């Protein structure tokens, strides 16, 4: 049940890294990245067995690896807070676009703080 | 001539952007149904320039022109919209500031994608004042207002609410020409977005910074508020801290 979601994450991850080599356009790799985060959330939603929270984290990691930024995951209690550094203005709005959409497909609430190159996302469920 | 078809494919086999690939096919697929010399020449020039550009903003705006002229069949039927695009392209070549070049082209794309004449008029006159003034500090302020106002229009905002947004665009430019600080201009961009969405805001002045609390903003509205403020704050060099909690956006403008 979970092996299906991880296998799909691995296929979208290698597609994200494939488009990362091209860099053909700046916003294009960003719109391609958020679509990949969308396909993962719509896939994990088709397996209700899979953790809805962990799905959002995977889609976030998908975006981080697509844009070539850095990520730190803090797990305390039931909520998970990811800190992403190295974002430009375009990557900031795109990461927010992916988190807001995958949080919905999976039915998860998120708290997002954008400040400079850093976006801090709290995933709770 | 049908050299359009050749110039279109050449971009289509060269592109890495899927939408650019679509517009090039669409522009060539609307031009061969026309015998107007202007249309065949405008699309030819547009596809030629975009074939010789490495800036995705230029390529998209050039292709958006060629599609806009090929569908109408008459250049006179989109001659207004044609002017706004030819002004941003000119301004893009005139400036050396990458934020100005990106701001002029993105505002023209957003204004053309939006179907509102008030946005078209606003962006047009905003580009004319930018090209007239040789002051980069003023040009950035004008573009921060225009590109933001365009994002409201492309978001499908009501014409009754774009009216109240334009009054703040006029106020922002007037304040910028009187040497308003970048923080004051960023606060006015936020004021424009709020009034362009039928929402209220609360301001707090805990020191030399401003805290703005926006309540009742829909998820589709919070994305475009984030995009306009982040772009205006990068144009002005202002540090903003934006927090998304439930239905409340908290922006901290710092100087």
Numbering used by the authors:
A (entry chain B): 0 to 124
B (entry chain A): 3 to 257
Excerpt from the publication:
Several natural systems exhibit ‘facilitated dissociation’, in which an effector (E) can bind to a target–host (TH) complex to form an excited ternary complex (THE)20–26 from which the target dissociates quickly. We use a switchable target binder (host) and a flexible effector that can rapidly bind to and switch the target–host complex to induce a large steric clash with the target, forming a strained excited ternary complex.
We used X-ray crystallography to structurally characterize multiple states of our designed systems. The unbound structures show an open hydrophobic cleft in the new designed state X poised to bind the effector, and the effector-bound structures show that binding the effector causes the two switch domains to register-shift into the designed state Y. Structures of the target–AS1 complex show that the target binds as designed (top), with some strain suggested by small variations among the structures (bottom).
